[PDB]
Ligand SMILES: Cc1cc(NCCc2ccc(O)cc2)c2nncn2n1
């Protein structure tokens with residue numbers, strides 16, 4: 483049921499998505515170990531992801547959350563990086579898209595920083611890097627991220643499975659690295675919708 487529609491670089495929608503992508507790159511404490519060394523991306527394609535069934539599943543859950551949270555879904559747009567992107571955009575997020583060993587427990591993790599999600603496209607910790615060159619910093623091979631609609635509802639704040647009782651998600655608030663943005667976790671696949679598929683390369687800095 484999934485269809486991918488390409489946005490053209492002349493569309494303001496393409497342009498706003500690229501800017502969210504470029505504007506939220508930061509340096510990582512691993513010096514680039516997981517995701518590579520880069521300050522910006524070369525965006526090759528932005529596709530909108532259309533799947534009526536996944537969308538209806540997402541909106542259904544969004545409404546239940548909103549009614550449980552003073553009519554506020556607390557919907558954000560956040561990045562997600564995974565070797566399972568192809569499964570996600572055809573079948574939706576599910577338990578098999580859970581980072582079993584994440585900091586906030588087995589769930590589905592998202593980030594405000596595109597460069598954080600970029601660390602996961604090739605696996606936990608960057609795995610062994612691109613399949614062609616086994617290079618976590620590969621400037622050649624094409625990568626893909628999702629920019630997703632995520633329902634947070636009442637989110638539990640954590641300064642640094644199930645949500646804590648009373649809550650629909652966990653917000654991981656950056657607590658030492660002053661430049662980091664927030665990271666979020668949800669525990670039900672229906673609370674996210676993989677709205678844009680972004681194909682890109684990291685760029686070698688000058
Ligand atoms: C911790 C984390 C994991 C992310 N993705 C994990 C994808 C994944 C990779 C391998 C695996 O066995 C399960 C999930 C992620 N994306 N954007 C931000 N994050 N943050």
Ligand SMILES: [Zn+2]
Pocket residue numbers: 612613614615616617620621622623
């Ligand atoms: Zn490569």
